[PDB]
Ligand binder design. Structure first.
Ligand SMILES: *[C@@H]1O[C@H](CO)[C@@H](O)[C@H](O)[C@H]1NC(C)=O
Ligand SMILES: CC(=O)N1CCc2ccccc21
Length: 357
């Protein structure tokens, strides 16, 4: 089944990196008042040289010119209850990541800019165009996303809420689901000064990206960190306390992209063993006061649009169940239907339900 259909944005000034129109894939579900808007991930680029390389060999992440007319909804975007016990009957939207800016940008291609970085405006424009296609009747809009798209949820969920309130739709409850987008600005296992793309740690790359992209962050977080320090708001544990919309956080404790930016590449000796155990402990610590969260002790990356997303469990509860319990909690804790699920065991795949690879 190729069930989500492409719509290029009617406002063609809201563009992917190369100026081609951005867009979204939609599968409507008549009579459902639930809307799931999913933000794709896929790293980022932060200067002309590394964006030019991404344009050669990752062009679908910078351009709509070669996008297919349809995509199959998978995982949480599946319309089959067998694959998606949580929201199989929802209106489904997949928003391709073509702005390379962790969904933060608000800059057009121009005389001075080789590329457009419009991630934050793409989300706003998708929402605006969907209102005319049934979103005006929604009761819940779940803004979800994986990897850079998960960070994109944290950066944009409150702006979607503000946008709907000020367009006159205060009854739409905006919520976020951030998958694999909760990163730590920690010490690398082996250290590299930022002199090129590979050596350059995410705090510095994001610092440069914000200026290159004209990147924007949520207002309360911006007001805390102030000018020049907005990069802090790309780190979940710093931006989450500032957010007003309910946000469910999904994060593997030993996320593969976290390990990549930490220069860890997997007989593990003591220094690396301690490094990995400390990373899991720090991640667990950052989630202690996140009431809706699912954080399994696995070495993996992304979950919610994988077809076998139903398989992993923490304390005997799967993610689709936890998300269902979250919906119920947003109607005191619920008997047998938990929403805070963080593994405490200290090594990858100490949870037997971890993805096998
Ligand atoms: C098109 O999008 C741009 C960027 O958000 C915005 O400035 C402009 O008002 C939009 N135009 C229309 C007609 O929607
Ligand atoms: C893979 C990815 O997307 N990463 C890794 C580090 C980071 C920091 C903020 C936002 C995104 C990302």
């Amino acid at each position: 089944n190729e069930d989500l259909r492409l719509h290029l944005l009617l406002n063609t000034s809201v563009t992917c990196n190369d100026g081609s129109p951005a867009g979204y894939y939609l599968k409507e579900s008549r009579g459902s008042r639930r809307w799931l808007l999913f933000l794709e991930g896929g790293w980022y680029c932060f200067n002309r040289e590394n964006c030019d390389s991404r344009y050669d060999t990752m062009r679908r992440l910078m351009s709509s010119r070669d996008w297919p007319r349809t995509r199959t909804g998978t995982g949480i975007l599946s319309s089959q209850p067998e694959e998606n016990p949580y929201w199989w009957n929802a209106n489904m939207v997949f928003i391709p990541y073509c702005s390379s800016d962790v969904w933060s940008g608000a800059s057009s291609k121009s005389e001075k800019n080789e590329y457009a970085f419009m991630g934050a405006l793409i989300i706003q424009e998708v929402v605006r165009e969907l209102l005319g296609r049934g979103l005006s009747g929604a009761k819940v809009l779940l803004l979800a996303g994986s990897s850079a798209g998960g960070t994109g949820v944290l950066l944009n969920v409150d702006r979607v809420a503000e946008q709907l309130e000020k367009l006159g739709y205060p009854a739409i409850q905006v919520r976020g689901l951030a998958d694999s987008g909760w990163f730590l600005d920690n010490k690398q296992y082996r250290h590299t000064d930022c002199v090129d793309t590979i050596t350059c740690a995410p705090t510095e790359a994001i610092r440069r990206g914000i200026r290159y992209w004209n990147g924007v962050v949520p207002e309360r977080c911006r007001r805390q960190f102030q000018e020049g320090e907005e990069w802090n708001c790309f780190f979940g544990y710093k931006v989450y306390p500032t957010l007003r919309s309910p946000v469910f956080v999904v994060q593997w404790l030993f996320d593969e992209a976290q390990l990549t930016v930490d220069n860890v590449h997997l007989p593990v000796q003591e220094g690396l063993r301690l490094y990995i155990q400390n990373l899991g402990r720090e991640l667990r610590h950052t989630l202690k006061d996140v009431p809706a969260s699912f954080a399994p002790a696995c070495l993996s990356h992304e979950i919610i649009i994988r077809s076998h997303w139903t398989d992993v469990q923490v304390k005997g509860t799967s993610l689709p169940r936890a998300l269902h319990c979250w919906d119920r909690s947003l109607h005191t804790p619920l008997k047998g239907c938990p929403v805070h699920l963080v593994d405490s065991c200290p090594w990858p795949h100490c949870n037997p339900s971890c993805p096998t690879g």
